[PDB]
Each structure stands twice: as structure tokens, then as C-alpha cells.
């Protein structure tokens, strides 16, 4: 029976310069997949036999900065599980 | 149980089974895949081939049939359903799977 890490702000350690950390939203979010219902099939040009419902650990807010010379990284500042195919 | 955010594993639930043509719609006990899965987005821009994310998904499947009651003479009433043996955390391949978001509890007759 296994656990999954909360979706939170971790620290990216390749871009983090001391006293200038870059935060990344890493973590786990709830998802599920069951077989596509009949209703839905009668909606598809190409029948999909399985339906996946999913949320994903993403940035609620962030600021695009630049670091270590010329990397143009986006530094997150709040996470949450959201639409996965954005 | 002990996990707060359970990793992807089959969990049994009841799903609505019906065939276009028989009076009733029934429900059968099966196992689907539901759980948590680790995702993350890149911080570095210059977005090199954007990192595709994973969904909790079927691994090993089994099928079980059932004879639908009420079906008139002629119509075939045996309907097979998928049952999750193994669940795994992998990407949603858009060829076979309908990769979408949360519809609130679609597993239901009527
Ligand atoms: C990236 O964003 C973080 C988040 O605000 C910035 O670091 C914050 O700095 C304050 C003051 O030291 C501390 O609270 C934390 O280190 C960070 N905030 C939080 C809520 O933990 C960081 O400066 C940003 N990086 C750049 C280059 O702007
Ligand atoms: C959804 O449809 C896919 C495509 O046929 C199924 O995948 C195949 O499953 C069979 C057994 O049912 C295997 O023998 C094949 O090797 C699989 N092929 C591929 C490309 O995946 C899948 O089993 C179906 N899943 C559900 C839940 O019904
Ligand atoms: C599926 O597993 C067992 C099988 O007997 C079942 O009793 C249980 O209710 C289901 N598990 C969960 C987590 O719902
Ligand atoms: C749901 O389906 C089976 C069908 O025989 C049932 O016996 C059991 O409660 C569940 N299956 C498993 C593998 O837990």
C-alpha cells in the first residue's frame, strides 16, 4: 500500500544559487482511469475504450526570471493540482 | 489506511453496464485504477519538447462477461467488461485513451 508526495514547492538544485533559490512544483495529484462509458462512445469518431480523468501538480503562480548567466527559468511560488493537458 | 495520498493501484468500484437494446442497465463489481501519481513541470524555458505528464493507468487487464436481463430474442446480451489486475503510472497515450480531466462520477446507469 503506497504513499505519494504532496504536491508542493521543492527546491530545484541545478538553478538554485545560494540566496537565490529557484522553486519547482513537484508532487503527486489524484487521477483515475476506468473504461469509457457507452454514452461517451456514441460521441467518438474514433472510439476510445478507456477514459482517463486527471489533475496534475502545476504552478498556481510564478515569475520568469533569469539566472546563472542566461538561463531564463520560471520560478514558481505556489502549487496546486490542475488541468493536466494545458 | 495509512497512506494520505495513495499511489496508483486498482480499487474496486461498480460500473454501469448496458447494451443499446435491452430494457435494463445493470452494475458490476470490478476494479478500476485510481490513485496518486508523481508529476512536475520544467522550470527552464526555451521549452525543449515539453515534458508530457503521467496519469494513473491500467497495466494488466482481464475481461469478464455478463448476460444482460430483459434483452429481447435476437439481440446478444452477453457484455464483457474490463477488470484491472495491475495498475501503473504512465502517460496517457491519446490513440487508445481519452485523455481528459475530472468528470464527477460518470460510473453510473441512467
Ligand atoms: C524565486 O521565488 C522565491 C519565492 O519567493 C524567492 O525566494 C524567497 O525568498 C524569501 C526571502 O529569502 C524566502 O521566504 C524564501 O527563500 C523564498 N520564498 C518562500 C515563500 O519560501 C526567490 O528569490 C526567487 N528567485 C529569484 C531569482 O527571484
Ligand atoms: C483498450 O483497448 C486496447 C487496444 O486494443 C487494449 O490493449 C490491448 O489489450 C489486449 C487485451 O485486451 C492485448 O492483447 C493487446 O496487446 C493490447 N494492445 C495494446 C496496443 O494495448 C486494452 O486491453 C483495452 N483496455 C481496456 C481497459 O479495455
Ligand atoms: C477492492 O479490493 C477488495 C477486494 O475484496 C475490496 O473488498 C475493496 O473494497 C476494494 N478496495 C478498495 C480500496 O476499495
Ligand atoms: C470485484 O470483482 C470480483 C468479481 O468476481 C469480486 O469477486 C471481488 O469482490 C472484486 N474483485 C477483486 C479482484 O477484488
Residues of A within 8 A of B93 (CB-CB) are none
What 3-state DSSP class applies to B53? coil
Residue A69: domain span:
1-86
Say how far apart CA A21 and CA A12 lie, in whole Å: 7
Any idea what the Cα angle at residue B44 is, between residues B39 and B45, rounded to 5°?
Answer: 110
Q: Note the Cα B17 to chain centre separation in Å.
A: 13
Please state, in angstroms and rounded to a whole number, the distance separating the CA atoms of residues A1 and B8. 10
Contacting residues of B for A53, CB less than 8 Å apart: 100-103
Q: Considering the domain B1-110, what is its CATH architecture?
A: Ribbon (2.10)
List Cβ neighbours of B60 (8 Å cut-off, separation of 6 or more): B84, B85, B86
The interface residues of chain B toward chain A in range 30-89, judged by CB-CB distance below 8 A, are: 32-41, 43-46, 53, 55-58, 81-82
Domain ranges of chain B: 1-110
Residue nearest to atom 28 of ligand 2 (CA): B82
The H or E element spanning position A39 is: helix A38-41
A51 grid coordinates: 477514459
A14 CB-near residues (< 8 Å, 6+ apart): none
Domain CATH number, residue A61: 2.10.90.10
In this structure, the strands spanning A79-83 and A74-76 are: unpaired
Best mutation site among B32, B59, B61 for ligand 2, i.e. most ligand atoms within 8 A of its Cβ? B61
Amino acid at each position: 500500500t503506497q504513499d505519494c508526495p504532496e504536491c508542493t514547492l521543492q527546491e530545484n538544485p541545478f538553478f538554485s544559487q545560494p540566496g537565490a533559490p529557484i522553486l519547482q512544483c513537484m508532487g503527486c495529484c489524484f487521477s483515475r482511469a476506468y473504461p469509457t462509458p457507452l454514452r461517451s462512445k456514441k460521441t467518438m469518431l474514433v472510439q476510445k475504450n478507456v477514459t482517463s480523468e486527471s489533475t496534475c501538480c502545476v504552478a498556481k503562480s510564478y515569475n520568469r526570471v533569469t539566472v546563472m548567466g542566461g538561463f531564463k527559468v520560471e520560478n514558481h511560488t505556489a502549487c496546486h493540482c490542475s488541468t493536466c493537458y494545458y | 489506511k495509512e497512506p494520505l495520498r495513495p499511489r496508483c493501484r486498482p480499487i474496486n468500484a461498480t460500473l454501469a453496464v448496458e447494451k443499446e437494446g435491452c430494457p435494463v442497465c445493470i452494475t458490476v463489481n470490478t476494479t478500476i485504477c485510481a490513485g496518486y501519481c508523481p508529476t512536475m513541470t520544467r522550470v527552464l524555458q526555451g521549452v525543449l519538447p515539453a515534458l508530457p505528464q503521467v496519469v494513473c493507468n491500467y497495466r494488466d487487464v482481464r475481461f469478464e462477461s455478463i448476460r444482460l436481463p430483459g434483452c429481447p430474442r435476437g439481440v446478444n446480451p452477453v457484455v464483457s467488461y474490463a477488470v484491472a489486475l495491475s495498475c501503473q503510472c504512465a502517460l496517457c497515450r491519446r490513440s487508445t485513451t481519452d485523455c481528459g480531466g475530472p468528470k464527477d462520477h460518470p460510473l453510473t446507469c441512467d
